[PDB]
Design a protein around this ligand. Sequence first.
Ligand SMILES: Cc1cc2nc3c(=O)[nH]c(=O)nc-3n(C[C@H](O)[C@H](O)[C@H](O)COP(=O)(O)OP(=O)(O)OC[C@H]3O[C@@H](n4cnc5c(N)ncnc54)[C@H](O)[C@@H]3O)c2cc1C
Ligand SMILES: Cc1cc2nc3c(=O)[nH]c(=O)nc-3n(C[C@H](O)[C@H](O)[C@H](O)COP(=O)(O)OP(=O)(O)OC[C@H]3O[C@@H](n4cnc5c(N)ncnc54)[C@H](O)[C@@H]3O)c2cc1C
Ligand SMILES: Cc1cc2nc3c(=O)[nH]c(=O)nc-3n(C[C@H](O)[C@H](O)C(O)COP(=O)(O)O)c2cc1C
Ligand SMILES: Cc1cc2nc3c(=O)[nH]c(=O)nc-3n(C[C@H](O)[C@H](O)C(O)COP(=O)(O)O)c2cc1C
Ligand SMILES: Nc1ncnc2c1ncn2[C@@H]1O[C@H](COP(=O)(O)OP(=O)(O)OP(=O)(O)O)[C@@H](O)[C@H]1O
Ligand SMILES: Nc1ncnc2c1ncn2[C@@H]1O[C@H](COP(=O)(O)OP(=O)(O)OP(=O)(O)O)[C@@H](O)[C@H]1O
Ligand SMILES: [Cl-]
Ligand SMILES: [Cl-]
Ligand SMILES: [Fe+3]
Ligand SMILES: [Fe+3]
Lengths: 484, 484, 374, 374
Amino acid sequence: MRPLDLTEKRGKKVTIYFEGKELEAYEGEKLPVALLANEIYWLTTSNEGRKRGAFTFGPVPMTVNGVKGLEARRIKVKDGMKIERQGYYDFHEEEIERVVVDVAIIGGGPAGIGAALELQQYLTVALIEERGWLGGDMWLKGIKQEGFNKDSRKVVEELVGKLNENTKIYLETSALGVFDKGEYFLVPVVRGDKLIEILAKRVVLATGAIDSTMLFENNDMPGVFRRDFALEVMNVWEVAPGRKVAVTGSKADEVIQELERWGIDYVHIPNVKRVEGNEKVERVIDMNNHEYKVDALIFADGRRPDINPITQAGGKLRFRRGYYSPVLDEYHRIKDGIYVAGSAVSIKPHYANYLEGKLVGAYILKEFGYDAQPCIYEEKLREYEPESLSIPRIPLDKFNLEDVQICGCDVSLKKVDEVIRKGITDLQIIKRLTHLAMGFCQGRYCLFNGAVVVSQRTGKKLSEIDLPVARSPIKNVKMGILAR
Amino acid sequence: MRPLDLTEKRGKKVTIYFEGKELEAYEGEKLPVALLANEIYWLTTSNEGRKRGAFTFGPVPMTVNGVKGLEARRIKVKDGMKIERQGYYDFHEEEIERVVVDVAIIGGGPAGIGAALELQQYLTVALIEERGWLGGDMWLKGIKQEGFNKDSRKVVEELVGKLNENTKIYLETSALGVFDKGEYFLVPVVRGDKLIEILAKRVVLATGAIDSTMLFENNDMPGVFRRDFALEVMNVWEVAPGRKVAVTGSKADEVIQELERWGIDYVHIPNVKRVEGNEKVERVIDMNNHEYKVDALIFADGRRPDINPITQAGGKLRFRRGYYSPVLDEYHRIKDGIYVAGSAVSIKPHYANYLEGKLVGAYILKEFGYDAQPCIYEEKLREYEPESLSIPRIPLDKFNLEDVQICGCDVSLKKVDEVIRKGITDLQIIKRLTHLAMGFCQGRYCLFNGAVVVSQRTGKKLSEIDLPVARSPIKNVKMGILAR
Amino acid sequence: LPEKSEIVVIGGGIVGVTIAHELAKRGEEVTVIEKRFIGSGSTFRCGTGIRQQFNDEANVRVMKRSVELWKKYSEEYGFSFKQTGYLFLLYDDEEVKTFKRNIEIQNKFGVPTKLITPEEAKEIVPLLDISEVIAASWNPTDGKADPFEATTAFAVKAKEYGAKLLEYTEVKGFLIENNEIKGVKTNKGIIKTGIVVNATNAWANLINAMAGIKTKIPIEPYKHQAVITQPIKRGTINPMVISFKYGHAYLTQTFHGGIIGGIGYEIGPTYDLTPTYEFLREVSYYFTKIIPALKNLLILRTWAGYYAKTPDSNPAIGRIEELNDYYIAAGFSGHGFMMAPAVGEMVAELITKGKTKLPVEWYDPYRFERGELR
Amino acid sequence: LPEKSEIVVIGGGIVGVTIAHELAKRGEEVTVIEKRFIGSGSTFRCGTGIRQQFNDEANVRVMKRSVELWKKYSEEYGFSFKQTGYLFLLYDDEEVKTFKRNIEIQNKFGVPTKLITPEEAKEIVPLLDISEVIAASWNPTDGKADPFEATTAFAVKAKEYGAKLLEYTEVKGFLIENNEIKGVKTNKGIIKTGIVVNATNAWANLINAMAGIKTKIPIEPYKHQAVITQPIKRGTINPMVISFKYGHAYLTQTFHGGIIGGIGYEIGPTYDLTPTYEFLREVSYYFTKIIPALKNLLILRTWAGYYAKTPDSNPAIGRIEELNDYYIAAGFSGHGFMMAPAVGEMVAELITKGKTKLPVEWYDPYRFERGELR
Ligand SMILES: Cc1cc2nc3c(=O)[nH]c(=O)nc-3n(C[C@H](O)[C@H](O)[C@H](O)COP(=O)(O)OP(=O)(O)OC[C@H]3O[C@@H](n4cnc5c(N)ncnc54)[C@H](O)[C@@H]3O)c2cc1C
Ligand SMILES: Cc1cc2nc3c(=O)[nH]c(=O)nc-3n(C[C@H](O)[C@H](O)[C@H](O)COP(=O)(O)OP(=O)(O)OC[C@H]3O[C@@H](n4cnc5c(N)ncnc54)[C@H](O)[C@@H]3O)c2cc1C
Ligand SMILES: Cc1cc2nc3c(=O)[nH]c(=O)nc-3n(C[C@H](O)[C@H](O)C(O)COP(=O)(O)O)c2cc1C
Ligand SMILES: Cc1cc2nc3c(=O)[nH]c(=O)nc-3n(C[C@H](O)[C@H](O)C(O)COP(=O)(O)O)c2cc1C
Ligand SMILES: Nc1ncnc2c1ncn2[C@@H]1O[C@H](COP(=O)(O)OP(=O)(O)OP(=O)(O)O)[C@@H](O)[C@H]1O
Ligand SMILES: Nc1ncnc2c1ncn2[C@@H]1O[C@H](COP(=O)(O)OP(=O)(O)OP(=O)(O)O)[C@@H](O)[C@H]1O
Ligand SMILES: [Cl-]
Ligand SMILES: [Cl-]
Ligand SMILES: [Fe+3]
Ligand SMILES: [Fe+3]
């Protein structure tokens, strides 16, 4: 057992080296998780000298066997592996498959599975998921779940269990976007390092929501965990974020329930001002200047639909219930032939998103001439009012602005605030002046916040501040993979 | 200047006596406010021995010149006045007007005024308000307001300014409910001690929202101020809640902005566990057991539509956006001939509620054959998404339950929790077993909380826990006033 | 949900549960079927009973007995029944003569009511305006109890003694073979039984209809109303005070401190609840005539409930002969709460022995078609 | 919003503002009218300029001059213009002969370009794959600058010098009296003026249409595209590297560290932006042929913008004679950012003196109807 193991691992034991030090890991574990288990948090430094971990926004470039600039999260641990830290900008110096399919479902959470289950009654589908497992956010929980009155992870197993050979599953697979060729849609997809082109008649974006990022002082430092990452390490791998854990944000109960299940000690800090520490977090300070000693901070401030795949697919947005949503016709369509389902549509219980996927799959099944009954899913859905999110009042005056990070790359809240103060309110321009939303997330974890700041400094309402649209490759792909 | 005066009062000086002590007050001031100015908070004791003030839920019975059981809030201060404390249940032992009118508007906030302004173009209306001033909640603010880009209280003056002789205003007037006689509606009304019967063809409920009550330990003790009361004493009268003030709840900024305007020092406690003190508050303790020394606590946790007048008028309810609302047809009607407008309908900016009142007045104007254009108000309204409210997770396990008060009368959270624990989930029964919602508020400040507790202990969703309806006199009336 | 039961009582109000209660402690197996919760319905909207001052032998004997059972079960199950008396205020020789006559019959059968003096009436209830009261009818062994408290108590004991009490369970029909009852059809399946008791007073007709009873048993729901004031010092108004002259007003103080009451004001055969402005005005006028201090008291709420009225204001309690093992105990016309313990006893004995100690035949189900009103 | 202005420049991109800038520092009164924000449009989507390696006298002289103005204004206003060179990679004798010939003409007019060696090309840009490059055209005084940074800079100076820059202000029509311009009609009122300059390149036709210009000045918007990679060590790729053989690829590193670039891949006359999968594939193929290390680099985003193309890839810059005081500076066909400082100078002189130092007549608006393509 390593110090942060929640279980004794029974996988094949393996040995790796971090900065020369000999560490034990298990086969199949991903680099940052093996290092966490061994109490190692600080994995890289940004170009302007900011220490960083793997469990919040931003990329983790690491030298993995003399090969510079590999992404830590993507790398499985391997016996004899030589791992080292490096600069942010340090790079290394040194057979297309075509598959035709009826629908192409992007995203493998409850919505995606839902759609696939409905669809494979008669059609051939691609279920595309970049994640390596086929649950959704649901596979991150293991707490009993409403709707299917049954344990979160047990439901996923049941559902995956029910998939046909009519469903081609694509794990560890990144969709690069959707391209309408009139007669079909092209969804180019990357798995391992092969490019696969999926030509489909229909598409469904079952694309999910992403966790909102909280603005407080060293919010990027090692040992801060965004909700999803904390749940992943605890529930998927079985590793604690730390020995004693601070928890914050408006959905902190979801996290606390997991902590309690695993018996991980914690404090609940409703309003975080700052985190401090040399390599990692060791104190958090609240808005009343109270300090708490802890090894990690976990924040959970609500999920918001990931709008990138929507807007690259050519969909339009609406602001409602504290977040941006897809504008849909009466059939959950973004545009003719592209359906949207799940937490991509709105925030609501897993079961609801599951139904919406079935709903969306049923419409296309009806399109195809099969006798489906989308409305039974429709009427089940209405039983679930979509959730709201409070819009954050960022106490700008009360923060030391250069310490609070807005995006992954450079980009402090101060830089953004500065340009707004000089009159610029158009996010298009803000994007260019500061590098907000130009980093390796494409604004996923910062655009909305940038908007909130403009809105706050301006008085201009959020339902009027329109968002820069997502462009060509919605996910990072390198570049060799795309020739010839 | 008395110690808690925010201004030097230039009204006619007067002198009163509290428990024998000689105090200075000004003419027109209401009893509890004069006593606050003179740093006196504890005004009564409940039947089970709980000390109480005037600025949260519950009645304030006081002996006012040897006459026992008069209500403090209703009594204007008068020269030579002899005021004393008394038991809760201590009582004293010792020409109907008929007015016919086209509409009868109940409630004199922006919605009511809005309706009246629209209506008096051609119709005769009664504007009924129990409050003594004709603003709404708006008259409690004096901060610049969106919509009419202009100071809150300046807008009210402008609007009242514009009222015809076609509008009979009834200040300090309590409507007892609405009674459909088919050919007209009867709205019996009490002013001073005369009963007035208003017979109207149409009615509009412009009835308002009420501030939610927060559940924490001594939430009823003297020196706790509900949002509306704190704003009233500060902005209407010009008296501070205390020299140094704790502020809590999710709408705490509204309050902080007023505090800052008046230069009243304060602390912001996001999560209150307890308040303590002998006669008054002197410390608040948070969920992490931090103490703060203060003279008062102000809580502002959101307003919710007052549903009483709605359900006594025979309207039905819907749960949405964290609160119960009236079910309306496509014309803002609860029932044929009864319109609903303002924060009675939903939570939204003052200006929106103003428009809704105009909207509602326009429909009835159209009903009457006049050429009105309700839709221009309609389309203006859509520019305003109605606000949500978070549903409170009451940390029941973390509270000492017998100290946290749910309703005005007896009724601790413990009493309610007990009966729920013994299997009872029907609020009808809870109402009867504990005396929840049987006190002199009729559940206004506790029914919803009672529901939240059931829901929390049960798992049963709030959109399924139906609410005991409001009955005969929606406001307290005594009893002599109703003979012959 | 049981599937067979020796006896099925329909309705779980004071009457229904009180009957089950007797049957169960007598060793019999009973299940009550209530469509909402135990004690919803009139029992939930009820005043505070309980009186022996009636005007005919049967009712006086039944209530004398009933009060004995209130004393017994009150302390035996710990549910609280204060014997604070009932006080009928009288204002003229007309009334005095009539009550002199009522008291006389009360006395014969062991209900020791006294005709009393205005000043005596004012000792009890000091706040009574005595100026036009010329005598009062007083009995110190009448009292008041909380109908909900008392029903729930009898309920948990009935269960303890082995009764099944079924709550969100509505009767919809009957399986009737020949003239044998075979089953009671519900919204949750059928229960096999040969003996059923209809205790649904306001709804009695509905149950009678489902049973195919062809005997005219006229029981109509009428809207009666009540008021509650703000709480007041304990023991300010102890007995139930009645004033026939001032609009059949009744008022007393609750255990909470309330002062509860209503008046005669009846609204024609309806199932409608929902209070009325006219009642609000009238009750205020009547109460403040009878005790003037009430003028300074806040009214908090008003509500409504059913009287299940018969043409002679007496219930129908008996065996219906043409359906095999059908009984009725319904139509208590405003005073069925106070009777309940005794009717429980009577119905049990009917089921159980075929006859009763008390004069149950006064409440003959057949009296109405026979033309014999009491 | 002014109501009279001596000169009105339509369009506030690099060209529009750069023209205003010259006019204003020359003492003239200018207001620019931009329908969105200063520097939106192609300037906002633009690569990083700036080149003197053209194939004819006029363009070479204009760009030589232009580069002098880039040096001057760059340091004088503090906006940053790195002279890292332009590098044309050559692969065959065909190309070598042609460039030998281009360089020759470049040299005559004071642009000291050298034909260079593969290994020399690889010293500059160490990551260049040199295996099939046989020579390269190199000029060390070509460079790159941020079009947005540079436009905003010229913008604030133009204002400082007294120019009015109107932002959310669209031109919709013209008040034309005889053949006199009298006013420019907008979405926010009319502005009186006698002299207008059309600098809206992709939109030039629209403005020409509103003006009633009957001369054929064919300028079509075409969709060109660009890619940006993840940031990389500073100074990894310094000059703009061009490869005609590999799909008219151009790539260089941004000041942020990006490596930006595009290819020839043109999409027929359209106003559509929105990138395409086919461009994504092609750029990846071409870039990785030219510098192989790019294979390991993440692509972050792709975008599109307009080339405002003419039939001979040269702008139309001149006075239109039949409308009184109408000028055009539009149709820069992909290299209008680099030209801007010089065209500013030229247009100013036209307005101001009636003729220009530089050979502005090469860009004759009338050449197309006359049949004279360059
Ligand atoms: C305002 C008011 C004041 C009163 N004050 C007094 C008083 O002071 N003293 C006094 O003695 N009496 C009083 N009464 C009358 C007293 O409430 C009734 O006499 C008494 O409640 C009758 O009890 P019950 O069980 O017969 O009727 P209920 O309490 O109505 O019980 C009948 C039950 O049968 C159920 N039911 C109906 N249909 C079905 C079905 N199909 N299936 C299953 N269940 C069904 C109903 O749900 C109901 O709960 C008062 C009544 C009112 C309205
Ligand atoms: C991908 C790409 C890369 C490029 N790379 C380079 C490069 O490396 N070097 C180089 O020199 N050039 C490059 N270019 C071309 C360069 O962007 C253009 O030549 C240059 O921006 C032209 O500037 P402009 O001011 O004439 O046009 P614009 O920048 O488009 O300005 C015209 C303005 O007129 C405005 N307008 C239009 N209609 C109206 C109206 N009715 N009223 C008011 N305003 C109106 C528009 O809003 C617009 O802002 C590149 C272009 C693209 C697309
Ligand atoms: C010089 C230049 C540099 C750019 N750098 C980046 C970058 O570093 N990251 C990024 O995501 N986009 C970058 N872009 C693309 C911008 O997002 C660009 O303005 C754009 O995408 C146009 O907006 P649209 O895609 O919404 O139409 C750059 C564009 C230019 C012209
Ligand atoms: C014995 C008794 C006491 C009551 N006491 C009170 C009371 O103190 N306060 C109150 O508001 N209502 C009181 N009520 C009225 C209840 O709210 C009653 O159950 C009722 O209003 C019926 O429900 P409804 O009005 O929703 O139909 C009392 C009712 C009864 C029968
Ligand atoms: N471009 C993409 N390529 C492949 N997978 C993607 C892409 N974008 C998003 N996804 C995946 O889509 C999945 C979204 O599932 P998620 O569980 O978040 O939402 P859901 O299925 O609507 O239901 P719920 O949100 O309730 O779990 C995630 O697993 C995410 O990795
Ligand atoms: N029964 C009643 N009799 C007389 N007045 C009443 C009665 N019930 C509510 N009111 C009054 O109605 C008014 C409601 O106005 P309020 O300002 O709360 O809402 P609004 O006019 O919809 O707009 P806003 O909520 O934005 O101010 C209050 O002044 C309240 O005192
Ligand atoms: Cl009855
Ligand atoms: Cl161009
Ligand atoms: Fe980013
Ligand atoms: Fe209450």
